């Protein structure tokens, strides 16, 4: 097994949790091909974000919420929707398919790294910035889906 | 990620949309083994062609329609059926299994390449000629299925 | 695509048709792990043999029928059941699991190689001897399943 | 096919039987990402252990039973549950998710190696010690699942 960073280990879990149908090894081919697929993917991610406390194996805290934005041509216009846990009202989204540039879902998760316990140390803090992108910049009929993260580390 | 041409990017989307059960990396093994599979595959492709506007993530225009042909031994006889969107009457197809040479579904899709917008340029036009082949020339009990395209580019 | 013989092309179709859940590239790992799986596999193969005319994309003729045998310890005892198309009475099979050596399904399919037509030649004849084996000789709790063939060629 | 030991052949069967959704080649990526998945996995393993006689293709004898333990932070506390075939009362398990270190399912299976018969020899005895681990020591939101075994061999 190849070693990765703590953030990366967490990120793999994030891909399984937020990306519908995701499976290991499909990172650079994972994509959407229909409107329904793109809708299900977006909703699944948000639903999962809202259900996180009752399903995740990790212990992530929200950091207020979630921004669902879609960028399309009117000039590029960004159109964002806010989702404040604890749960909805956003399932009436209408994608500007013909004008679509991309769609992004952005949110942050806060957590502790418990590996410190084995060495009798107070765990330090990790705040993950999650960005899920449905990229349509190639306007090719194929929209690749990706999830990347960035971590802010500091003592709690 | 390996770069491919615009036509090729579009073609990958076409394989996911028109080939039933298709999945990346199965291009040279993708095939049919039963009559039902061959029937479902053909119908799925045509149905998808008819539903294109309500499902595709790309913006393809029809170019009048779709030709469903089957070639079999009487001398090789070609037997074509026309499908003019916007939708049917062709689901009563009867495949000459024992005589079957192949079956092809041919149609063209017209679209614009919006990548021009980022450089403030008028998009040029692409007309894709789609050919789906169910090849039975080996008469081996295995019919490989393939989708290939050709593009006609010009200013709109 | 790697060239194989006509028999081999046909054999690939046979694996898709008679082996339940079979998929390309799983030939040397394909196996059964439960009694139900082993029962479903055996029945699926026989059912498929009986339905062959209404489902196969090839044109295979029976050569009278099908022998379902199981070998187990009493000395190794072979216990065969006959299936004469056109269809049953064999679904009451009781596998000597604890004593099981293996199980084999044997039958022959006769057909013509139509590739001759393109060169205006009378097709020669192929008689395939199909042998499906559920090997339990390792008595390891894992029974690998395999299908192999042999061809008898001659003018019709 | 690569040769492995008798124990290893048996172990592969054990992975297919006790690990939910397991498939060949996924050994070092196989993991759980949700509470429900972790619950289903644990229950599936135990249920399978209890049903073993009616489903397995091997002939394994119990060696009294099965220990379902979970380790979590109060200091690391181990909390075990006993399952004595022939069947339950353990499906009311409550996982200390936030405190979870790991979870292990331990049991032993006894059997004979019938390969001796082909050489007219009395089979020797194998007692497999099975250990299924749901490792959460990385506290990364991803819990890798693994099954390993050890064998005690001796004349019966």
XYZ file of C-alpha atoms in Angstrom:
624
model
C 0.000 0.000 0.000
C 1.259 3.425 -1.012
C 1.471 5.960 1.784
C -0.496 9.150 1.302
C -1.094 12.045 3.680
C -3.840 12.135 6.293
C -5.714 14.626 4.102
C -5.431 12.254 1.164
C -6.685 9.257 3.172
C -9.658 11.380 4.203
C -10.149 12.530 0.603
C -10.489 8.948 -0.614
C -13.304 8.471 1.898
C -14.840 11.724 0.609
C -14.876 10.378 -2.960
C -16.709 7.212 -1.883
C -19.185 9.246 0.216
C -19.979 12.177 -2.106
C -19.462 10.823 -5.635
C -22.325 8.615 -6.797
C -21.098 5.321 -8.186
C -17.479 6.203 -7.559
C -15.042 3.306 -7.282
C -11.301 3.127 -6.711
C -9.173 3.565 -9.831
C -11.766 5.490 -11.825
C -10.585 8.973 -10.877
C -9.581 10.213 -14.324
C -12.442 8.702 -16.295
C -15.228 9.351 -13.790
C -17.766 11.530 -15.619
C -21.404 12.272 -16.426
C -23.031 11.750 -19.819
C -26.698 12.619 -19.284
C -28.744 15.331 -17.628
C -30.268 12.840 -15.209
C -26.816 11.542 -14.231
C -25.596 15.066 -13.637
C -28.701 15.822 -11.562
C -28.442 12.619 -9.503
C -24.749 13.225 -8.904
C -25.286 16.749 -7.639
C -28.187 15.786 -5.402
C -26.423 12.716 -4.064
C -23.453 14.847 -3.021
C -25.610 17.403 -1.211
C -27.841 14.759 0.421
C -24.687 13.023 1.652
C -23.358 16.301 3.004
C -26.583 16.719 4.983
C -26.638 13.133 6.254
C -22.918 13.079 7.120
C -23.312 12.739 10.929
C -25.526 9.652 10.657
C -23.471 7.836 8.031
C -19.770 8.737 7.978
C -17.134 6.621 9.729
C -15.154 9.745 10.428
C -16.138 12.510 12.852
C -16.491 15.661 10.782
C -17.889 18.945 12.069
C -19.593 21.486 9.788
C -18.025 24.939 9.293
C -20.667 27.550 8.408
C -22.433 25.743 4.967
C -22.441 24.281 1.440
C -22.328 26.338 -1.781
C -23.905 24.856 -4.915
C -22.904 27.017 -7.863
C -23.341 26.726 -11.594
C -21.535 28.882 -14.123
C -23.018 29.533 -17.547
C -23.050 32.042 -20.385
C -25.517 34.949 -20.239
C -20.090 36.826 -20.119
C -19.813 34.049 -17.524
C -22.466 34.198 -14.814
C -22.035 32.361 -11.511
C -25.247 31.299 -9.785
C -24.896 29.964 -6.245
C -27.315 28.275 -3.858
C -26.751 27.985 -0.118
C -27.342 24.876 1.928
C -27.017 25.325 5.660
C -27.120 22.082 7.474
C -29.027 20.589 9.216
C -31.196 20.065 6.080
C -32.943 21.285 1.896
C -35.088 23.529 -0.396
C -32.447 23.222 -3.140
C -33.811 20.280 -5.127
C -35.578 22.578 -7.569
C -32.285 23.367 -9.302
C -32.486 23.974 -13.049
C -29.247 23.470 -14.924
C -28.458 25.853 -17.775
C -27.309 22.843 -19.851
C -26.923 24.672 -23.154
C -25.012 27.522 -21.485
C -23.230 25.456 -18.808
C -19.559 26.096 -18.078
C -19.357 23.950 -14.950
C -20.931 23.282 -11.581
C -19.168 23.202 -8.250
C -20.128 22.113 -4.772
C -18.013 23.651 -2.053
C -17.963 22.997 1.687
C -15.580 22.536 4.596
C -15.305 19.757 7.170
C -13.522 20.081 10.480
C -11.985 17.222 12.424
C -9.301 15.943 14.750
C -6.477 13.498 13.956
C -6.774 10.842 16.667
C -3.492 9.150 15.767
C -2.046 11.343 18.548
C -3.669 9.169 21.188
C -1.347 6.220 20.646
C 1.512 8.541 21.660
C -0.404 10.139 24.529
C -0.666 13.482 22.698
C -3.459 16.034 22.266
C -4.713 15.738 18.661
C -4.159 18.667 16.345
C -6.914 20.040 14.112
C -7.663 19.575 10.397
C -10.104 21.647 8.364
C -10.711 20.206 4.907
C -11.878 22.437 2.070
C -13.833 20.206 -0.318
C -14.419 21.168 -3.953
C -16.437 18.932 -6.254
C -16.313 19.974 -9.911
C -18.488 18.970 -12.851
C -16.356 20.408 -15.642
C -18.054 21.283 -18.924
C -15.398 23.661 -20.295
C -14.659 21.309 -23.187
C -18.352 21.430 -24.193
C -17.875 17.921 -25.554
C -21.001 16.197 -24.277
C -18.860 14.592 -21.579
C -18.618 16.170 -18.145
C -15.749 14.825 -15.992
C -16.452 14.862 -12.253
C -13.699 15.448 -9.706
C -13.244 16.025 -6.004
C -10.157 17.717 -4.592
C -9.337 18.995 -1.144
C -7.041 21.323 0.728
C -6.285 21.155 4.432
C -5.792 23.831 7.050
C -3.914 22.377 10.032
C -3.430 24.012 13.449
C -3.701 23.171 17.136
C -7.306 23.057 18.302
C -5.138 12.246 -19.264
C -4.362 11.619 -22.917
C -5.409 14.371 -25.287
C -7.771 13.377 -28.064
C -9.544 15.507 -30.656
C -12.846 17.277 -30.075
C -14.526 14.662 -32.280
C -13.006 11.909 -30.171
C -14.128 13.496 -26.884
C -17.628 13.684 -28.339
C -17.363 10.088 -29.572
C -16.647 8.819 -26.064
C -19.876 10.471 -24.919
C -21.629 8.818 -27.886
C -20.447 5.372 -26.757
C -21.832 5.906 -23.245
C -25.130 7.256 -24.650
C -25.844 4.809 -27.499
C -24.149 1.552 -26.466
C -26.102 -0.347 -23.820
C -23.920 -1.355 -20.903
C -20.848 0.232 -22.423
C -18.047 1.157 -20.034
C -14.635 2.722 -20.542
C -11.885 0.298 -21.550
C -14.183 -2.323 -23.052
C -14.013 -1.085 -26.638
C -12.396 -4.127 -28.235
C -14.271 -6.803 -26.318
C -17.695 -5.148 -26.283
C -20.035 -7.595 -28.035
C -23.399 -9.359 -28.112
C -23.928 -13.066 -27.478
C -27.702 -13.547 -27.599
C -30.612 -12.505 -29.775
C -32.197 -10.595 -26.908
C -28.943 -8.717 -26.242
C -28.651 -7.809 -29.895
C -32.281 -6.655 -29.929
C -31.948 -4.607 -26.725
C -28.745 -3.026 -27.991
C -30.288 -1.951 -31.272
C -33.427 -0.586 -29.650
C -31.509 1.176 -26.905
C -29.409 2.989 -29.502
C -32.433 4.149 -31.496
C -34.445 5.110 -28.388
C -31.453 7.149 -27.221
C -31.210 8.816 -30.613
C -34.862 9.845 -30.296
C -34.539 11.049 -26.702
C -31.250 12.892 -27.311
C -32.566 16.450 -26.692
C -33.968 15.582 -23.259
C -30.971 13.611 -22.017
C -27.645 14.566 -23.609
C -25.203 16.965 -21.942
C -24.142 18.179 -25.344
C -26.266 20.249 -27.731
C -26.674 18.165 -30.867
C -28.988 19.029 -33.746
C -30.494 16.375 -36.038
C -29.570 16.328 -39.748
C -32.345 14.763 -41.851
C -32.737 10.969 -39.934
C -31.516 7.570 -38.694
C -30.962 4.505 -40.911
C -31.321 1.058 -39.331
C -30.023 -1.504 -41.803
C -29.385 -5.214 -41.641
C -27.438 -7.155 -44.238
C -28.055 -10.851 -44.783
C -27.830 -13.589 -47.392
C -30.774 -14.114 -49.762
C -26.059 -12.521 -52.631
C -25.937 -9.953 -49.819
C -29.189 -8.065 -49.309
C -29.295 -4.772 -47.407
C -32.574 -3.985 -45.658
C -32.918 -0.484 -44.220
C -35.499 1.153 -41.971
C -35.903 4.906 -41.588
C -36.387 6.710 -38.315
C -37.162 10.390 -38.611
C -37.097 12.103 -35.312
C -39.063 13.260 -33.388
C -40.170 9.652 -32.635
C -40.948 5.153 -33.728
C -42.808 2.368 -35.644
C -39.526 0.444 -35.999
C -39.700 -1.843 -32.966
C -41.173 -4.670 -35.015
C -37.764 -5.442 -36.514
C -37.077 -9.102 -37.277
C -33.423 -10.028 -37.506
C -32.395 -12.554 -40.149
C -30.160 -14.244 -37.534
C -29.281 -17.316 -39.583
C -28.489 -15.186 -42.648
C -27.109 -12.129 -40.816
C -23.969 -10.428 -42.104
C -24.183 -7.366 -39.866
C -26.431 -4.552 -38.724
C -25.637 -0.868 -38.799
C -27.251 2.218 -37.355
C -26.285 5.411 -39.116
C -27.103 9.023 -38.278
C -25.537 12.469 -38.120
C -25.410 15.017 -35.307
C -24.672 18.688 -35.782
C -23.171 20.971 -33.166
C -21.003 23.938 -32.296
C -17.642 23.938 -30.483
C -18.116 26.462 -27.673
C -14.444 26.485 -26.692
C -14.256 29.557 -28.963
C -16.056 31.654 -26.377
C -13.135 31.759 -23.960
C -11.170 33.515 -26.724
C -14.058 35.757 -27.766
C -14.482 33.929 -31.093
C -17.510 32.758 -33.085
C -17.675 28.947 -32.755
C -17.119 26.874 -35.859
C -19.397 23.978 -36.802
C -19.023 20.199 -36.409
C -21.197 17.581 -38.087
C -20.564 14.088 -36.750
C -21.353 11.044 -38.870
C -22.119 8.211 -36.443
C -21.896 4.555 -37.474
C -22.743 1.789 -35.025
C -21.861 -1.695 -36.272
C -22.931 -5.117 -35.035
C -20.464 -7.222 -37.006
C -21.366 -10.841 -37.721
C -18.969 -11.435 -40.634
C -17.035 -14.021 -38.630
C -20.276 -15.992 -38.100
C -18.766 -17.177 -34.827
C -21.712 -16.800 -32.470
C -20.091 -13.624 -31.156
C -21.089 -10.251 -32.559
C -18.688 -7.402 -31.670
C -20.353 -3.994 -31.365
C -18.550 -0.795 -32.324
C -19.220 2.893 -32.772
C -17.020 5.093 -34.942
C -17.417 8.636 -36.160
C -16.212 11.065 -38.776
C -16.451 14.834 -38.551
C -17.214 17.491 -41.123
C -15.946 20.870 -39.891
C -16.724 24.291 -41.397
C -17.793 27.765 -40.317
C -21.480 27.908 -39.453
C -7.296 -7.672 -31.350
C -5.469 -10.978 -31.086
C -6.373 -13.539 -33.713
C -7.665 -16.855 -32.443
C -9.071 -19.827 -34.335
C -12.693 -20.163 -35.406
C -13.171 -22.745 -32.645
C -11.751 -20.307 -30.120
C -13.999 -17.446 -31.280
C -16.950 -19.796 -30.876
C -15.657 -20.916 -27.470
C -15.663 -17.347 -26.169
C -19.341 -17.120 -27.108
C -19.878 -20.454 -25.318
C -18.377 -19.051 -22.104
C -20.724 -16.046 -22.169
C -23.730 -18.292 -22.940
C -23.159 -21.232 -20.563
C -21.188 -19.782 -17.637
C -23.356 -17.768 -15.257
C -21.873 -14.370 -14.524
C -18.886 -14.997 -16.751
C -17.064 -11.935 -18.060
C -14.021 -11.494 -20.273
C -10.677 -11.721 -18.478
C -11.925 -13.795 -15.554
C -11.057 -17.198 -16.998
C -8.502 -18.300 -14.414
C -10.248 -16.968 -11.327
C -13.816 -17.862 -12.293
C -15.071 -20.188 -9.545
C -17.873 -21.178 -7.178
C -17.804 -20.716 -3.409
C -21.236 -21.859 -2.224
C -23.609 -24.741 -2.810
C -26.246 -22.411 -4.221
C -23.727 -20.883 -6.645
C -22.661 -24.318 -7.793
C -26.306 -25.335 -8.233
C -27.250 -22.158 -10.126
C -24.207 -22.505 -12.357
C -25.004 -26.080 -13.298
C -28.667 -25.370 -13.946
C -27.939 -22.204 -15.887
C -25.627 -24.131 -18.209
C -28.180 -26.869 -18.879
C -31.096 -24.423 -19.264
C -28.989 -22.485 -21.769
C -28.190 -25.681 -23.637
C -31.922 -26.367 -23.931
C -32.813 -22.818 -24.973
C -29.915 -22.508 -27.442
C -32.029 -22.265 -30.643
C -34.092 -19.343 -29.335
C -31.203 -17.336 -27.906
C -27.832 -17.964 -29.566
C -26.449 -15.693 -32.291
C -24.785 -18.677 -33.872
C -26.565 -21.548 -35.627
C -25.702 -24.680 -33.680
C -27.291 -28.078 -34.244
C -27.574 -30.696 -31.482
C -25.706 -34.017 -31.819
C -27.454 -36.797 -29.871
C -27.579 -35.063 -25.971
C -26.081 -33.543 -22.805
C -24.359 -35.530 -20.029
C -24.433 -34.112 -16.495
C -22.042 -36.142 -14.369
C -20.746 -35.818 -10.846
C -17.833 -37.792 -9.459
C -17.535 -38.489 -5.749
C -16.085 -40.942 -3.254
C -18.126 -44.024 -2.308
C -13.233 -45.502 -4.928
C -14.376 -42.759 -7.313
C -17.955 -43.148 -8.514
C -19.216 -41.343 -11.616
C -22.930 -40.548 -11.664
C -24.332 -39.254 -14.950
C -27.691 -37.788 -15.937
C -28.920 -37.524 -19.516
C -30.606 -34.502 -21.011
C -31.990 -34.993 -24.486
C -33.146 -31.798 -25.995
C -35.742 -30.478 -26.647
C -36.270 -30.059 -22.857
C -35.818 -31.329 -18.360
C -36.509 -33.682 -15.382
C -32.936 -33.135 -14.142
C -33.452 -30.266 -11.700
C -33.735 -32.643 -8.761
C -29.967 -33.160 -8.739
C -28.389 -33.713 -5.325
C -24.697 -32.942 -5.128
C -22.522 -35.210 -2.995
C -20.773 -32.089 -1.621
C -18.789 -33.826 1.108
C -17.650 -36.558 -1.300
C -17.444 -34.416 -4.458
C -14.477 -34.800 -6.796
C -15.883 -32.700 -9.632
C -18.866 -32.208 -11.898
C -18.831 -32.059 -15.664
C -21.350 -31.104 -18.300
C -20.606 -32.531 -21.711
C -22.318 -31.942 -25.048
C -21.568 -31.359 -28.716
C -22.703 -28.614 -31.082
C -22.610 -28.865 -34.846
C -22.344 -25.937 -37.226
C -21.120 -24.507 -40.500
C -18.432 -21.849 -41.041
C -20.127 -19.270 -43.269
C -16.930 -17.328 -43.939
C -16.759 -19.459 -47.111
C -19.562 -17.456 -48.679
C -17.471 -14.336 -49.206
C -15.230 -16.460 -51.455
C -18.124 -18.244 -53.158
C -17.275 -21.564 -51.470
C -19.369 -24.305 -49.854
C -18.855 -24.038 -46.070
C -17.092 -26.877 -44.316
C -18.414 -28.407 -41.095
C -17.415 -27.933 -37.441
C -18.499 -30.141 -34.553
C -17.563 -28.688 -31.177
C -17.139 -30.947 -28.160
C -17.944 -28.823 -25.103
C -16.732 -29.760 -21.620
C -17.632 -27.637 -18.612
C -15.776 -28.603 -15.435
C -16.434 -27.707 -11.808
C -13.164 -28.937 -10.325
C -13.106 -29.876 -6.646
C -9.952 -32.029 -6.683
C -8.146 -29.579 -4.407
C -10.952 -29.951 -1.827
C -10.163 -26.393 -0.773
C -13.643 -24.924 -0.450
C -13.095 -23.215 -3.799
C -14.334 -24.832 -6.992
C -12.872 -23.320 -10.193
C -15.201 -23.474 -13.199
C -13.882 -23.902 -16.731
C -15.128 -24.510 -20.242
C -12.913 -25.998 -22.938
C -13.668 -27.273 -26.401
C -12.318 -29.460 -29.157
C -13.353 -29.303 -32.793
C -13.917 -31.982 -35.394
C -13.721 -30.447 -38.879
C -14.734 -32.103 -42.167
C -16.720 -31.349 -45.307
C -20.456 -31.519 -44.696
C -2.158 -19.918 -12.086
C 0.153 -19.172 -9.181
C 0.508 -21.950 -6.643
C -0.390 -21.082 -3.077
C -0.622 -23.289 0.001
C -3.686 -25.305 0.962
C -4.359 -22.781 3.736
C -4.175 -19.962 1.215
C -6.556 -21.684 -1.224
C -8.980 -22.101 1.666
C -8.443 -18.474 2.705
C -9.504 -17.218 -0.720
C -12.769 -19.120 -0.291
C -13.089 -17.548 3.177
C -12.807 -14.045 1.694
C -15.601 -14.741 -0.806
C -17.785 -16.302 1.926
C -17.294 -13.864 4.829
C -16.501 -10.511 3.194
C -19.579 -8.806 1.766
C -19.051 -7.693 -1.807
C -15.517 -9.026 -1.887
C -14.058 -9.786 -5.308
C -10.687 -11.089 -6.443
C -7.965 -8.454 -6.760
C -9.507 -5.982 -4.328
C -7.628 -7.141 -1.238
C -5.686 -3.961 -0.502
C -8.419 -1.462 -1.304
C -11.349 -3.363 0.200
C -12.802 -1.062 2.871
C -15.878 0.453 4.508
C -16.907 4.101 4.250
C -20.232 4.307 6.091
C -21.742 3.094 9.337
C -24.317 1.024 7.478
C -21.600 -0.624 5.366
C -19.606 -1.443 8.465
C -22.725 -2.858 10.133
C -23.744 -4.932 7.096
C -20.211 -6.253 6.731
C -20.002 -7.380 10.335
C -23.427 -8.998 10.303
C -22.852 -10.664 6.953
C -19.671 -12.273 8.272
C -21.357 -13.615 11.406
C -24.491 -14.774 9.544
C -22.223 -16.610 7.104
C -20.337 -18.195 9.980
C -23.643 -19.493 11.349
C -24.912 -20.733 7.983
C -21.584 -22.321 6.989
C -22.775 -25.976 6.978
C -25.650 -25.273 4.580
C -23.703 -23.111 2.141
C -19.957 -23.793 2.021
C -18.380 -26.037 -0.620
C -15.797 -27.111 1.899
C -16.438 -29.287 4.956
C -15.518 -27.183 7.968
C -16.192 -28.163 11.571
C -16.673 -25.585 14.344
C -14.161 -25.406 17.222
C -15.775 -24.010 20.389
C -17.275 -20.289 18.929
C -17.006 -16.833 17.329
C -15.725 -13.697 19.101
C -17.017 -10.313 17.921
C -14.923 -7.620 19.571
C -14.701 -3.878 19.201
C -11.930 -1.754 20.656
C -12.498 1.896 21.487
C -11.305 4.688 23.753
C -12.870 5.039 27.215
C -7.264 3.845 27.585
C -8.253 1.243 24.982
C -11.232 -0.885 25.981
C -11.955 -4.210 24.281
C -15.603 -5.265 24.209
C -16.310 -8.806 23.026
C -19.507 -10.666 22.176
C -19.768 -14.444 21.954
C -21.561 -16.337 19.232
C -21.844 -20.057 19.785
C -23.169 -21.819 16.791
C -25.707 -23.150 15.957
C -27.295 -19.646 15.857
C -27.813 -15.197 17.264
C -28.789 -12.521 19.867
C -25.857 -10.357 18.717
C -27.564 -8.143 16.139
C -28.140 -5.395 18.685
C -24.488 -4.350 18.474
C -23.798 -0.637 18.903
C -20.521 0.556 17.454
C -18.585 3.197 19.379
C -17.922 4.999 16.062
C -16.431 8.162 17.537
C -14.173 6.149 19.864
C -13.564 3.169 17.550
C -10.068 1.725 17.230
C -11.057 -1.384 15.284
C -13.367 -4.374 15.246
C -12.361 -7.989 14.885
C -14.227 -11.208 14.284
C -12.333 -14.291 15.352
C -13.178 -17.967 14.916
C -11.611 -21.293 14.000
C -12.598 -23.874 11.395
C -11.460 -27.472 11.415
C -11.158 -29.686 8.363
C -9.418 -32.502 6.547
C -7.266 -32.289 3.399
C -8.786 -34.890 1.072
C -5.978 -34.663 -1.479
C -4.550 -37.673 0.401
C -7.174 -39.940 -1.114
C -5.682 -39.875 -4.600
C -2.548 -41.434 -3.071
C -4.470 -43.862 -0.864
C -3.459 -42.011 2.321
C -5.318 -41.029 5.497
C -5.893 -37.247 5.346
C -4.132 -35.084 7.889
C -5.932 -32.345 9.820
C -6.055 -28.556 9.365
C -7.406 -26.075 11.897
C -7.711 -22.569 10.480
C -7.663 -19.554 12.780
C -9.658 -16.827 11.022
C -9.255 -13.147 11.901
C -11.326 -10.494 10.159
C -10.228 -6.934 10.927
C -11.991 -3.621 10.376
C -9.056 -1.307 11.038
C -9.793 2.248 12.151
C -6.380 3.067 13.657
C -5.770 5.751 11.036
C -9.028 7.471 12.080
C -9.272 8.705 8.500
C -12.932 8.073 7.743
C -11.865 5.000 5.778
C -11.863 1.589 7.423
C -9.933 -1.093 5.485
C -11.300 -4.618 5.914
C -9.031 -7.660 5.887
C -9.152 -11.378 6.526
C -6.049 -13.373 7.412
C -5.588 -16.914 8.615
C -3.147 -19.202 10.348
C -3.187 -22.982 10.190
C -2.495 -25.642 12.779
C -1.688 -28.940 11.045
C -1.440 -32.382 12.679
C -2.629 -35.943 12.146
C -6.282 -36.370 13.059
